[PDB]
Every structure is written in C-alpha cells, then in structure tokens.
Design a protein around this ligand. Structure first.
Ligand code: FMN
Ligand code: CL
Ligand code: FE2
Ligand code: FE2
Lengths: 117, 290
C-alpha cells in the first residue's frame, strides 16, 4: 500500500526507509488518489503537526489508517497524534513506535497493514 | 554586530522550540510534593538511600548543564535564534535543579540533605562522569573554537540530556510506576520531557555542524563520539553497581541506560549501538502518571 508521511528531524524518514514500501513525504500541494496509510510524528503535548492537519483536510477520503512516531518519555501523550487522527476520521491506529523504530516495529507495522487490507 | 531578528528566520525549527520551552516551563509551575511522606516512610532504609543518592546525581548533572554546558555552547553559535533557544534551555536546567531541592526538602531533614550534597561532591565516580562531559565544554573557554570542538561539545551535551540522566531517572519512575512517591514522580516526568526536547534540539544543531565538517573531520568526530559513548557506558555500569545492588535492580537499570543511550545516538542522527529492547514496563507506568 502507499505510505504518506511527514518527518521533521528524520526519524519518520528513517523508518519508512526500512519499510520497502512505496512512500512519499507530504507537502502542501500533494493530492493522493489511492488508499494510503499515514505515518506522522508527534508534536508538543501529543499533537498532530500542522502540515499533517492540512494534508488531511484535502486527503482523508483515501486514508485507511495511521501510525505515529513519538517518544515514550511523553507518557500518556506518547504517539498521541495517531489517537487524534484515528478519532477524527474513524480509521485504525496501525501502530505507535519510538523515534526511527526497532525491527519489531517495522515488522509489526507491515503485518498490521496486511491485516488492515 | 548582529541583533537577533525574529522576522527573518535563520533556520526552520528554532521558533517552534522557543515556543515549546515556554509552554513546558508553564506546566511546571502547577502543584507539588508532600503526599509522598505516606509512601516514603514505607520504603526500606536502602531504598530511601538509593533515592536520595540518585536525586543528588541528577542535581549535579542539571547544575553542570545550566552553569556550563548551555552557556559555553551558546556563546559560540552564530545562529542567534538557536542561541536564544539555548539560553532558555540553560535556565530550565536551573529550574529542574531547584525542583530536586524541593523534593529533597519534603523528604529529608536539612542535615540529611546536606550529607547527600557532601556525598555527591566527594564521590569519585560522579566527579569522573561529570568531569568527562564538562571537559568538552571547558575546551570552549577561548575566543575561537573549531567546528570539531563545537560538534563534540554538542555530542557531549546530548549524551548528558538523553542518556546520562537516565541511570538516576530510573528510580523515581520505577517507584512511581508502583504508586510510590508519585508526586515527586510527576515532577521528574515534567523534567524528562524538557530534557527530551533539549537533546533533540542540541542534536539538530550537532547534525548541522557535522554536515560542514570535511570527510576527514567527520571520520575523526565519529570515532570520538563512539569512544565517548562507551567510555560513558562503562562509567554508568559502575555507577549502577554502586547505587542499585543494595536493592537488587542493577541489571534493570543497566538495560534502561542502553535504551536511552540509543535514543541519544538517534538525537544525533546516529544508528543505535546497543541491542534494542522494550522499555521496562514498571518505569513505563511511572511515565504514564497524570
Ligand atoms: C517539541 C517536541 C514535542 C514533542 N512532543 C511529543 C509528544 O507529545 N508525544 C510523543 O510521543 N513524542 C513527542 N516528541 C518526540 C517526537 O515526536 C519523535 O522524536 C519523532 O520521532 C520525531 O519524528 P521526526 O524525526 O520524523 O520529526 C516531541 C518532540 C519534540 C521535538
Ligand atoms: Cl524524541
Ligand atoms: Fe534539566
Ligand atoms: Fe536539559
């Protein structure tokens, strides 16, 4: 499946590179016509990055699910960007992972995507 | 001579960190510890000693990072917006240090607190640990500094922010995750989210400097970075033995130190060096308070 993502400091980018899945960094002009999964990072107090919020205003029809990168140091806000997008558009939380992810997270993410398709 | 002009961005991330420091500062001035007396008196003598000692260690690292690492790093940056972000991070290390005092006061007599400070001051392993990191900062006490020197100070600083604190962070989280001393735990939780964004910001600054090093300079600082990391690891394993063996938690702590070392490397743009393992779940529960 196609993976749309956003990365500010490189972590999300490094995770998508372990994926072997077609994937594209979101920008403001981007329209996505096929089913896709979103991978986002998480910004202060468990929030969704603005660029992601914009990109979903125009692209949620094909959104089939969402993962979040974060840091468990944030407690009950770890990865909370996935919760907010999941609730807002009624799509499954695929997974949450820290930073660039571990191999478990990568393998976990792929299994979840089959399962979800 | 330049004045900081926020109407022309010098980078793409400084303004967000500026704002974010201020918003975390604000959440830190709301409630405090006292309710902890109930669970504090239920710990064994050995537990209370471990706790006091780790908090002593945390306070030492916050003191050095506010009084030395932030100031000497910031005084050479040419990017004035980042320099302002660091000045403010630097002040936050002092707010954290003052929070540890506040916790101490709600848990020990002035005489006990004072003994804990004497102990930290005279403790060879903490001197050595603090001494290695601050030797990267002290190298910046001169009018002109190389990119390499400055990069290595930033590596040292993120190893402190994202990695060295965690051998002491373990205990209060571990107890709070068991519902012991959870008001002190909540203060530590807040301090930990400051330190995580400090280690991300300094690691971004580091990766910019690294991108301007020659290929030869890059290979050199990559070597020094891997040396420093493992020199610190080896000191931490020894520190962990001294503090935790009395209470049976030495290998739990050591594994949490590896877990965080790998986060620090990743703050620098680097690959993890320790085998990847799930976070201690009791500590995770301590992080999940309020
Ligand atoms: C200013 C700031 C706020 C953050 N807030 C959260 C948070 O609330 N929850 C979380 O799990 N992680 C949080 N993080 C951690 C990042 O989401 C995590 O580092 C992510 O891997 C970064 O993705 P990227 O490198 O692709 O930008 C925060 C990091 C920063 C720098
Ligand atoms: Cl992070
Ligand atoms: Fe601090
Ligand atoms: Fe810090």
């Amino acid at each position: 499946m196609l993976v749309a993502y956003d990365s500010m400091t490189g972590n999300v980018k490094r995770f998508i590179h372990k994926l072997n899945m077609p994937a594209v960094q979101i920008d403001e002009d981007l329209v996505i016509d096929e089913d896709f999964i979103l991978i986002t990072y998480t910004t202060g107090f468990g929030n969704v990055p603005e660029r992601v919020l914009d990109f979903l205003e125009r692209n949620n029809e094909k959104l089939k699910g969402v993962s979040a990168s974060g840091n468990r140091n944030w407690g009950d806000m770890f990865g909370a960007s996935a919760d907010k997008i999941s609730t807002k558009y009624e799509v499954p939380i695929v997974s949450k992972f820290e930073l660039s992810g571990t191999n478990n997270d990568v393998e976990y993410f792929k299994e979840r995507v089959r399962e979800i398709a | 001579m330049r004045a900081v002009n926020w109407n022309k961005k010098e980078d793409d991330f400084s303004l967000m960190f500026w704002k974010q420091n201020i918003a975390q500062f604000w959440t830190e001035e709301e409630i405090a510890v006292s309710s902890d007396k109930n669970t504090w008196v239920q710990l064994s003598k050995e537990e209370q000693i471990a706790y006091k000692r780790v908090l002593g260690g945390l306070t030492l690292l916050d003191t050095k990072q506010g009084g030395e690492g932030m100031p000497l790093v910031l005084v050479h940056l040419e990017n004035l917006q980042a320099k302002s972000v660091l000045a403010f991070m630097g002040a936050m290390e002092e707010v954290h240090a003052k929070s540890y005092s506040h916790i101490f006061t709600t848990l020990a007599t002035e005489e006990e607190i004072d003994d804990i400070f004497d102990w930290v001051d005279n403790h060879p392993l903490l001197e050595k640990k603090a001494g290695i990191i601050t030797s990267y900062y002290r190298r910046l006490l001169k009018p002109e500094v190389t990119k390499k020197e400055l990069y290595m100070a930033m590596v040292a600083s993120v190893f402190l922010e994202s990695y060295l604190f965690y051998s002491g962070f373990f205990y209060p989280l571990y107890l709070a995750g068991q519902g012991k001393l959870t008001a002190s735990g909540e203060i530590i939780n807040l301090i930990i989210r400051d330190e995580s964004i400090h280690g991300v910001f300094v690691g971004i600054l580091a990766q910019q400097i690294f991108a301007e090093l020659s290929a030869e300079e890059q290979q050199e600082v990559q070597k020094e970075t891997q040396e420093l990391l493992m020199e610190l690891y080896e000191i931490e394993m020894a520190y962990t033995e001294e503090i935790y063996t009395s209470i049976g938690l030495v290998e739990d702590v050591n594994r949490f130190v590896r877990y965080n070392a790998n986060k620090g490397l990743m703050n620098l743009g680097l690959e993890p060096k320790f085998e990847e393992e799930e976070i201690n779940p009791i500590v995770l529960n301590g992080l999940r308070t309020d």
